[PDB]
Amino acid sequence: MNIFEMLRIDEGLRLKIYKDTEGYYTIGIGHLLTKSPSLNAAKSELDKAIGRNTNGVITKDEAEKLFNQDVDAAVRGILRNAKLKPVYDSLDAVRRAALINMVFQMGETGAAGFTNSLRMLQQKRWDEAAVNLAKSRWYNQTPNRAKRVITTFRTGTWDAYK
């Protein structure tokens, strides 16, 4: 298991524009297009992202290309974030993937907002962090996915994804 496979399980793969859990226009493997309610605005952002007139549909290869870019960006966002970098550096390989997953889903700002959890993770207080992570809108809104990430942080294994 790895970050790519993990996120592919969590986000799915859709080749036509769709609405995410928050009702936002998305495509491929969890690639957010826009928060705007307009499909046209979505189609426009899509074409600009792909470099062609897509008519709201992309191929598997195009989806994967967006995905590679998105993962790279998440990582890079973590490394540039003063609150995130230190935690990431302190963690083992498996838990690093859990942190990338959160950043991919909620953005650097959102993840960085988990001040208390981050500190606990940095202290390697697994059970406490898991409890704290659960007291969030994130957990209440997408509980199954949140549980998978939380277990990953808690155990340092991929058990929740097998």
Task: Summarize as ranges the residues that interact with Cl ion (CB under 5 A).
Answer: 49, 142, 144-145
CA distance 36 to 45: 11
The one catalytic residue in 5, 10, 20, 92 is 20
CA distance 25 to 32: 6
Q: Scan for tokens 């793969």, then name that residue.
A: 13
The one catalytic residue in 10, 11, 45, 108 is 11
Q: How far is the CB of 128 from Cl ion (least distance, A)?
A: 23
Instruction: Name the residue nearer to Cl ion (CB basis): 105 or 117.
Output: 105
Please check if 136 is assigned to a binding site: no
Q: Say whether 61 is catalytic.
A: no
Q: How far is the CB of 120 from Cl ion (least distance, A)?
A: 23
Q: What angle do CA 84, 1, 20 make, to 5 degrees?
A: 65
Residue 64 is classified by DSSP as H
Q: How far is the CB of 94 from Cl ion (least distance, A)?
A: 20
CA distance 40 to 50: 15
Please check if 132 is assigned to a binding site: yes
How many CB atoms within 10 Å of residue 120? 21
Q: How far is the CB of 124 from Cl ion (least distance, A)?
A: 27
CA distance 72 to 101: 12
CA distance 127 to 104: 23
Instruction: Name the residue nearer to Cl ion (CB basis): 73 or 79.
Output: 73
Q: Say whether 159 is catalytic.
A: no
CA 72 from chain centre, in angstroms, equals 12
Instruction: Name the residue nearer to Cl ion (CB basis): 81 or 142.
Output: 142
Binding residues for substrate: 32, 104, 117, 132
Mind telling me the catalytic residues? 11, 20
